[PDB]
Structure formats: structure tokens, C-alpha cells
Amino acid sequence: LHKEPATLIKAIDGDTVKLMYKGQPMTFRLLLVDTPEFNEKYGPEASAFTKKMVENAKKIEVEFDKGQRTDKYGRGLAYHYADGKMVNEALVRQGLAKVAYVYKGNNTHEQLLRKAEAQAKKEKLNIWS
Ligand SMILES: Cc1cn([C@H]2C[C@H](OP(=O)(O)O)[C@@H](COP(=O)(O)O)O2)c(=O)[nH]c1=O
Ligand SMILES: [Ca+2]
């Protein structure tokens, strides 16, 4: 896998963000996670977490996995990095997302994320409280 550049257009919620990628606007859905919807418990906290992380970043990068790069809704599917830190992992580490939507061939970072979820669960963080 490799990182590619992108720029923030807009934070949307905990697990979706609008980015300019190869010069085109695209909504991205973060791989291998599920944040609560804004209207659910921890939804606002997930959205705010992702928003800060991507808005504060000097450099956003996306990393596609080895399978499908767009979902059925036309959303990009990627791992996202804010000054080199993975947003997808950071959400799970904080108990603001669950590992989810683990599909064959787009699962390169599954066990990394599961390890973060286990530490979040141990700490009874947010969703795991
Ligand atoms: C994360 C992810 C979601 N999706 C689709 C599956 C779900 O379909 P359904 O809408 O039919 O439930 C939906 C979940 O996204 P959200 O959690 O953003 O709703 O997005 C993928 O197809 N691939 C993925 O890698
Ligand atoms: Ca969601």
C-alpha cells in the first residue's frame, strides 16, 4: 500500500470526510471502521474527533487498500492519515469507532485496528463504557 496526497474540503462526520483527491472532490468513507451516526450516542464526539484531526493536519494522505476503491454510493474507500497518524486507527483507539465492514481484500490494516479496539475496550473508553 502507498500514501497519496489529498486536501481537506470538509469534515462530514466521524467516518466520512470530503477531500480533494487528484484534483476532484470526493466523499471518502474510512475503511474498517464504524462511527456512530451524529444522532447516536458518541456520534457528536466522533465527528468532532475526526474534524479536529483532519482540520488541524498540515498534510492529509489517503491510502487505498488492494480491493475496491469506491463503494456502492460512490464514496472513496481509504485509510486516512493526518500528519502521518491514521485517523481510522485513532478513532478505534479512543473508543469512538468499532472495527467493522471488514471485507476480504480491503483488510490490510485489520489486525492493527483490532489491537487498538482491544486497548480501547480494556480502558472502557467512550463506546466501551
Ligand atoms: C466501510 C464500507 C461501507 N460500505 C457500505 C456498506 C453499507 O451498505 P448499507 O448502506 O447498504 O448498509 C454502508 C455502511 O456505511 P455507513 O456506516 O457510512 O452507513 O456502506 C462498503 O460497501 N464498503 C466499505 O468498505
Ligand atoms: Ca457510520
Swiss-Prot record:
Binding sites annotated in the UniProt record for Ca(2+): 15, 34-35
**Could you name the domain of life of the organism this protein comes from?**
Bacteria
- In what ranges is there compositional bias, type Basic and acidic residues? 109-125
Localisation per UniProt entry:
Secreted
Q: Which residues form the active site?
A: 29, 37, 75
Q: Where is this region: Disordered?
A: 109-129
This chain's protein is named: Nuclease A
- Source gene? nuc
Entire-sequence positions represented here: 89 to 223 of 231
